[PDB]
Structures are given as C-alpha cells and as structure tokens.
Nucleic acid binder design. Structure first.
Ligand SMILES: Nc1ncnc2c1ncn2[C@@H]1O[C@H](COP(=O)(O)OP(=O)(O)O)[C@@H](O)[C@H]1O
Ligand SMILES: Nc1ncnc2c1ncn2[C@@H]1O[C@H](COP(=O)(O)OP(=O)(O)O)[C@@H](O)[C@H]1O
Ligand code: ALF
Ligand code: ALF
Ligand SMILES: [Mg+2]
Ligand SMILES: [Mg+2]
Lengths: 132, 448, 448
DNA sequence: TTTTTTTTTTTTT
C-alpha cells in the first residue's frame, strides 16, 4: 500500500526525485518489490529538469509502465508544495525500516542467546531514535 | 446492483492523518462529520476521535483503541490490527483537507441518491397522497440537502476584511443622501422618523387586540409602500378574503365611507373617486394578494421567490396573520409550531432582504390589567414571536375601552421593540369611516 | 471469567515514556502509583523506577536493567527484550500524562469493583452484623472513593474572619479602596469588584427580557475587554448580522447618536469621531465576529479552536444566543438540546480557559410577578442552564415597566449566581442614545 | 419531556 503511494508520488512530480536522500545501499528485499522504486529514483536522478511524460516513456519496453501510469493519476493534487512534505514523510517512514531491522535482529539475538551490556546498550540507542 | 459512490482511500487517509496530527483535526472537523463515512467502522472511529478530542485527549492509536474497547467497539472496527493498518497506510496529513472534502463529496452524493430513490418510491407508491404532497416532499428533501452544504461560508475568518467591508458599507450608506428614511417609507412622518422606514431583511410584528384595526394599519402601510415605490408588495390575507381587503383599500385611498362602498350607496363623486383609485392601482400593478387559508411557510417562501424572480425582488411582504399559518409537523405543540413559523418567516425575510410585516394578536390578560396599553408580554404564543421579531409595534386606542376618552380619533402606535432605534409612543389619526390612518396634527404630547 | 478492567497498552506506554523521558516522571508521579499497574511486572518496574529516581539515577534501559538484575527481579519482568519492547511500543512520551490518567481511571475502577465485591461478600455472610452495620460498612468503603470531591467552604465565616475583614476595611477607608482585578476587565468598577473580572474557564450567562440591552451590554463588555487586552475576543451573532453589531459598537465607542449612524446623518465632528474609532479598531484587530445562523456546538468549538491556534488563544467568547443554537440529534426534546448546548459550551470554556458570555432569554412568567426583577429560575429551560452556568447576570430596567420610575437611565445588573463570589445588585447609567452602559456615578443606595 | 393557553378557587395588597 505504502509502495503504491510512494510510486504514485514519484511519478506524479519527477522534480522532487532530486531531493531524495541516497538509498542505494539499502537492500530491495525488505519492502515488497522495492527494486522498482529504487530504479525509478536512480533513473529520475540521472536527468534533472525533466517532464512527467519523458519519465513515463522510459519504461515503455517493460510491462510495468501501466502500473506507473495508473498510480500517477491516483493521489493527484493541484498544489505542488503540499506534496513535498508528504513525500518527505514517506521517505522517512521507509528509512525507518533500517532501524526496525536493527532492533528486530537485536531482539531476536536476545531471545536466542541473550545480550551483553554493550548489545543492549546499542539496542537502546537504536530504539531511542524510533520514538523521535 | 449500483453500489453507492464512496472512496475508502480518502476515509483511511483522514483516519490515519488524524492519528498523526491532532492539530489538523479542525480542518477535518469543519469538513467531515461522523455520518459522512460510507463504512460504519469509519463512522464509529470518527465518533470516538471526536469524543476524545472534545475531552482534550490526544487522538492516537493506543488512546483510540482503548476508548473503543471501553465501549466494546474495538473489535467492531477491525481491532488493533486494523487501527495499526490505518495508521501505517497514511504517509502524512498534509493532504488531509482534500481527503475530507472528497469524503464530503461522496457522502453528499450518496445523500442525493438516497433522496432521489425515496422520491421515486413515493411516486410509485403514493399511499393515497396527492401529487402536490409528493412534490412538496421532494421540494423539502432537496432544500434540506441544498442548505446542508452552507458550511464553507458564514464563519469568523480574519476580521480585517469584515471590518473594512462593514465600514465601507457604512460610508456608502452615509454618502447616499436620504431624506431620513433609508427603507420602505411607512407613510407617516413620526413613524418614519422613529423607524427610518421598514428596513430590509427585518421582521416587523404589528399586534393589538382584535377589532383594533391591526389589519387596517397593515393595509395602510401596504398602500403607502405601493404608492411610494415601484417594487411589488405581497399580501397573505389568511384572515379575510381579497374582496374585503380590496374594499378597505379603496375606501382608504378614496377617503370614502367603507359602509357606502360595502352597500353600493355611492354617489357620482364617490364613484369618480373610486374610478380614479382604480386607475391609479391599474397603473401601478405592484400589488399581489393571496387569500388562500392554511398557508404554510414553505408555500409562502416558494411564492415569494416566484414573485421576486418574476419582478426582480419584493419591496414589502405582508402576512395576515401569524397564528393562522399551519405546520402539521408541529401541530401537536402549538407553541413549537408558532416558533417554527416565526423563525421561517425571519429566515425568508433575511433571504429576500425585504421587510415582512406579519401580524399578531394578544392574550386576554392585557385586558385584565388596569393599564390596557399593550406591552411585549401580551403577545399570544408569545415567547418565540418577540425573539424572532426585530421590530414590534402595538396598536392601542383608549377610546375603545373608555367611552369618555379625550383621545377619540387617536391611536397609539407603541414601538415596543427596535434593535437599532428608540422605543416609545406615536400618535395617529384613525378614520374608521375610511378605515385609514393619518399623521397626527394635534398638539404634541411629551412622552414621560 | 470477567477479567478486571485494565490497560496493558497504557501501562506499557507509561513505562516506555519513563524510559525515554525522565523529566516527565513528576507528572506521572502525582497521577499514578506502583499499585495502579494491573500487571505485577509493571508494578515491579515502576517501583524500581521510583527507587532510581529517589536515588537520583537516570531512568533508562541500561540502568533499569542493571538495577532489576541486581535485585534478581529482571527475569520476573522479561529482561532486556521486554524492557526494550516497553520503550519501543510507546508512540511518544509527550502523551505520558494522558496514559497516566487512563491508568488512574483503571485503578479507581478496579478499586470500586473490589469494594463492591467486599460489600457483596459481607452481605452474603453478615456474620451477625446488623443491617445498620452492613450499611455503615458500605458507606465507609464508598467514602474512600469520594475523597477526590471534598466540599470546600459553603459560606459560614467565623467571627475572627469577620473581625479581620472589618478592621481591614475600616483601615482602608482612609486608604485607597483598590478592586483587585485579576480576570478579564469588565470595564466597570463595581462589576469588576464583585466579579474580579470575567474568570477564565467559567461560564457566564447574561439574561434579560428582550429590548433590555442584553446584546448591548455584551457588546460593551466585549469592546472594553478588547481595549483592555491584546488577546483576541470572539462573538457569534446568530441573532443579528455583523453590520448591525458593528454599527452598535461604533455608536457606543464614538458616543454618537446611533440613529444618525444608521441613517447616515453624520456631521464633520461625528465623522471625525467615527474615523478615530475606525482607526483604533483597525489598529487593534483583536475582535472576531461570526454572523452564522443556526450554529451547532461542534462548529463553534472548531472555529474557536481555529482562531485560538492562529492567534495563540482568545481573550473572550460571546454567543448571541443559546436558544438559537441547534442540535439536530436532540431536536426531538428542546430541553435536552438546550442542556447539551450548555454542557458543550461549558466544556469549551474549560478547554480553552476563556470567559464565555452566552446570552439567554426568560419565560414570560417573570412579568406575571408583582416584582419584575429577574431570578435564576426565570431562565427558559432553567433546568440545565442554571446548573451549568457559573456566573449568572440579569439585566433589569424599572423605567421600562414604569414610565414614572425615579431610576430613569439606570440599569440593574444583578449577579444572581456566583460560585466564587457574592450575589447582589449593581447599578449602571444606560445611555440609549449611544446604546452604552457607564459606571453609575449617582448616589449609592443601600443594598437591602 | 416541555411550553402554552386559559378556566377555576384561594390568598395577598
Ligand atoms: N364605518 C365605520 N366607522 C367607524 N369605525 C369603523 C367603521 N368601519 C370599521 N371601523 C373600525 O375599523 C376596525 C377594523 O376592525 P378589525 O379589522 O376587526 O380589527 P383588527 O384587524 O385589528 O382585528 C373596527 O374595530 C372598527 O372600529
Ligand atoms: N436611539 C435610541 N435611543 C434610545 N434608546 C435606544 C436607541 N436605540 C436603541 N435603544 C435601546 O437599546 C435597546 C436594545 O434592544 P435589544 O438589543 O433588542 O435588547 P436585547 O439585546 O437585550 O434583547 C432597546 O431596548 C432600546 O431601548
Ligand atoms: F379581528 Al382581526 F385582524 F380583523 F383580528
Ligand atoms: F431582543 Al434581543 F438580544 F435583541 F433578545
Ligand atoms: Mg383584521
Ligand atoms: Mg439583542
């Protein structure tokens, strides 16, 4: 669901794709079908100063262009500056998956064979960032 | 099966954004209500959020879930898992206003569809109701939906513009050099001075005991307005047929005895005056009369709108009189019926922005007091009438209750209520021979 | 197996917030105790947190885990995993106060359930205890619950306080009799003295018969508050359009004949006064008006929240008037609708912590009494308005009901109900020419 | 569940 919103926002306003913080190091296996989003972000970053049609026509060789076109119309709003905050919030939510992974693995290791002082300390440090 | 139009995505987005930002609740609050949500779980969720926010509590996943569980409604809304899904699916509350507007659109469309279906069902099965009843029902149903959308305007937005507009309007009124009367001239110097005429949008109630000439004074004001303006004037003579009202009007205008006109014992000069009055009226054609009895506010409003559209507005409206009007929906409680009638007439006056003189009658307690001069307390079915009444004038005649009165031929118009002006007594000459009121030209009595 | 009422989520949120924000321990310390946590591990964790705070150590995951392990109770709670989960599952510690309040609610409800269980057990087995003994046991058990109610003072002040007040006043007669204004200034010396200004969070109901200057008095109060404060004030003029209200305000401020203002018969000096008033008002921009018709309480609340958030609070709210407000849900019973409106407005005043002058109207029965001075029961639907109202002020004018009255130009503001102050009459000079009230400078009449 | 109306019988001024 969130992936559909992210893709729709990315396709609707290709200009904002230049403001995306780097996410190349992140694995695409965490979120479902995240490879399409990362590929779209990299492609849109490669050509700053573009229109929505020229971004849409890029993936005409593949069969996933229909999804991009159907998502672009969806969640369409006239105001431009309003969408930047929503996109930023979605990006922050997506980036929070890394902290989610890190705390989940630490909790799993705690349940498997416990944790030492430093391990629970780093778990606490990671968890403090989740609330804020 | 034609599914009702709806947008689950907009509702979910609003629900999630409210959990993410309580501050924008106001933006959601003035745009959407609980009943708007197509899905009942969303209705319950919105109700619980409103209850919590009204208490000052923060609208969040945990507090909302526990609040629903306190009423056993959590599992009815999909549970904590569904609430977490709603919280997650919303990225941010920036576009929450658009989502609320979309939800409002869908809800109003479903309401329109429901009203249309009900009207169609009634048409298929009138259950003995005449066509007029069904058409009036459809009128009311459509008008309700039309009025239910008046939520974007009429609010206390940034005052500066409102103050500037009001001051500009005041300056415009000042610049227009009127002769003291800024509204419909009443035809009487003292009454116009104290009232500045019958103002637009204002509800005026003229009252007195029966036989006091209340209808006489009303018709005199109507004639003055018609002669002093070209805009039409509308009369609802529920009390009397149009024939007697027109006979009174001719007697007053011609200053000929009403008895002779009623009896037809008219001489050549009297008939000449009558013919001149008829010619003047036929030249004006700014008067419309309805003698239909039992007229409800709905029919009065519809006919007023018809006349205004056909003639570009109405200068004045006249109703004879309030207590005769019918509201079957409130027939059980007479007081509630009268309050509804008065409020509807006030609303109609504001909408058409025209003076509306609706006549009224007093309780008998007045005549049980030592002083028989009417006051505000004396109105019958009284409480709501005075509240909706913007101007209140009572008609008194000491000669009526005192044969040896020195005020024979004199009538007291007591302005008892005036929002933007002084209250007090005025005197007029009453020619019951002609059923007319005239400016008082005797010695001026100082009002103590 | 009816589980005792509880909230795992609330306790987990409170514990996680304490792990996250130690500064909010005090806000939690007053609300809840260790016993209030339904689950024993949460009781242990809160006890350890209290012990650490008392010793001054910070409350975090590492310190709490170390302290619990040192006591051997770490296993009883779940270790680093469970405490990390407690810290994790809390959306934010900013709402820890609400979670603590909910936990206190659950604890009080569980205490009540336990009390009921004990009373039922005693009833099943009196053990020779008389019915009086069982009743006294139940009453003693219940009185523990009602410790958070109290009764405060009811009026009886002892001889020592009387002597102290008498000495203070006898000494200050030589000195300056200051008022002690703390609330929003009413603009009048006597009214401020008796009320100490419009108290925030307190509901004030100004009532009067129509035409008594109710709206006039409210507008004068609002204007005085605006000129004596910088916080914005708010008005809901359902009864009248904004234009008439603004004209009244300008006429009062400029002390010019409002009739001239309405008619546009304004001279150069009056025009200069009007221009100065306009300049002052456009300089302030601390007054907001809504000319909406048929506002529901929710709409008023939302709009007030909007204005307060935009301008950081509201100095004063005014509603004209209660009987105009609409509640479609309770339209069936008028009294219930009025009661709910009053309750919602009182809750709004408490939440916004602002004085709220909501106007009300009286039943005609008042004028049936020999003395027409209003009293509390004279309110229409007095059942709920009187209960909710914290301050009740009635406007009376003997000149209105007696033209030969010796109090001409004098209006009586009678504080008939005041929770935190004395009831009694106050006099003001009413200039109907300007539609204004002024401090009464005439001879003081003994309040008998 | 309430506001009206308006009888009737009393008191009080
Ligand atoms: N020929 C006449 N001479 C004197 N007075 C008359 C004559 N005809 C009608 N009137 C007066 O006109 C009044 C009109 O009465 P009516 O319309 O019933 O009063 P309202 O409209 O206030 O109920 C009567 O009270 C009567 O005194
Ligand atoms: N030009 C004037 N001269 C004297 N008094 C006036 C003037 N204009 C208005 N008033 C007084 O102002 C009062 C306002 O009436 P209104 O606002 O209807 O009363 P309320 O608001 O108490 O229901 C009236 O009772 C009237 O006596
Ligand atoms: F008797 Al009428 F108006 F004529 F009340
Ligand atoms: F008649 Al009003 F407020 F003016 F009750
Ligand atoms: Mg008549
Ligand atoms: Mg008023």
């Amino acid at each position: 669901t969130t992936m559909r919103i992210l893709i729709g926002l990315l396709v609707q306003n290709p200009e904002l794709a230049t403001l995306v913080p780097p996410l190349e190091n992140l694995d695409e296996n965490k979120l479902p079908g995240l490879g399409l989003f990362r590929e779209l972000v990299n492609t849109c970053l490669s050509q700053p100063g573009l229109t929505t049609g020229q971004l849409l026509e890029h993936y005409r060789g593949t069969n996933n262009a229909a999804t991009l076109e159907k998502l672009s119309m969806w969640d369409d709003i006239a105001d431009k500056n309003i969408a930047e905050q929503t996109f930023t919030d979605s990006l922050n939510h997506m980036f929070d998956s890394l902290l989610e992974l890190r705390q989940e693995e630490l909790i799993a290791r705690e349940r498997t064979h416990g944790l030492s002082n430093e391990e629970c300390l780093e778990l606490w440090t990671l968890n403090q960032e989740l609330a804020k | 099966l034609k599914v009702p139009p709806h947008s689950i995505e907009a509702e979910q987005s609003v629900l999630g954004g409210l959990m993410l930002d309580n501050e924008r609740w106001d933006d959601v609050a003035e745009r959407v209500v609980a009943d708007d949500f197509y899905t009942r779980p969303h209705r319950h969720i919105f109700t619980e959020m409103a209850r919590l926010q009204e208490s000052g509590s923060p609208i969040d996943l945990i507090t909302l879930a526990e609040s629903l569980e306190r009423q056993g409604q959590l599992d009815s809304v999909g549970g904590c898992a569904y609430l977490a899904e709603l919280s997650k699916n919303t990225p941010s509350a920036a576009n929450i206003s658009a989502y609320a507007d979309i939800v409002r659109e869908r809800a109003v469309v479903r309401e329109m569809i429901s009203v249309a279906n009900e009207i169609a069902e009634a048409g298929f099965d009138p259950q003995g109701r005449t066509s007029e009843d069904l058409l009036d029902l459809a009128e009311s149903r459509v008008f309700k939906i039309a009025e239910s959308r008046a939520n974007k305007d009429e609010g206390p937005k940034n005052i500066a513009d409102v103050l500037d507009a009001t001051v500009a309007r005041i300056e415009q009124l000042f610049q227009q050099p009127h002769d003291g009367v800024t509204g419909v001239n009443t035809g009487y110097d003292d009454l116009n001075k104290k009232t500045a005429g019958l103002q637009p949008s204002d509800l005026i109630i003229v009252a007195a005991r029966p036989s006091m000439g209340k209808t006489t004074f009303a018709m005199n004001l109507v004639e003055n307005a018609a002669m002093l303006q070209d805009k039409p004037v509308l009369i609802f003579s529920l009390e009397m047929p149009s024939e007697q009202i027109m006979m009174r009007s001719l007697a007053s205008l011609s200053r000929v005895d009403q008895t002779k006109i009623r009896t037809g014992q008219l001489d050549d000069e009297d008939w000449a005056r009558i013919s001149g009055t008829m010619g003047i009226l036929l030249e004006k054609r700014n008067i419309y009369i309805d003698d239909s009895s039992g007229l409800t506010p709905t029919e009065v409003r519809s006919r007023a709108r018809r006349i205004a559209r056909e003639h570009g507005g109405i200068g004045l409206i006249m109703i004879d009189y309030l207590q005769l009007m019918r509201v079957p929906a409130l027939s059980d409680n007479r007081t509630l019926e009268i309050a509804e009638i008065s409020r509807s007439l006030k609303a109609l006056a504001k909408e058409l922005n025209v003076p509306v003189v609706a006549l009224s009658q007093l309780n008998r307690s007045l005549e049980q007091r030592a002083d028989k001069r009417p006051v505000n307390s004396d109105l019958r079915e009284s409480g709501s009438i005075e509240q909706d009444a913007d101007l209140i004038m009572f008609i008194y005649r000491d000669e009526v209750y005192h044969e040896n009165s020195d005020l024979k031929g004199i009538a007291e118009i007591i302005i008892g209520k005036q929002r933007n002006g002084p209250i007090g007594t005025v005197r007029l000459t009453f020619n019951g021979q002609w059923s007319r009121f005239d400016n008082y030209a005797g010695p001026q009595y100082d009002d103590e």
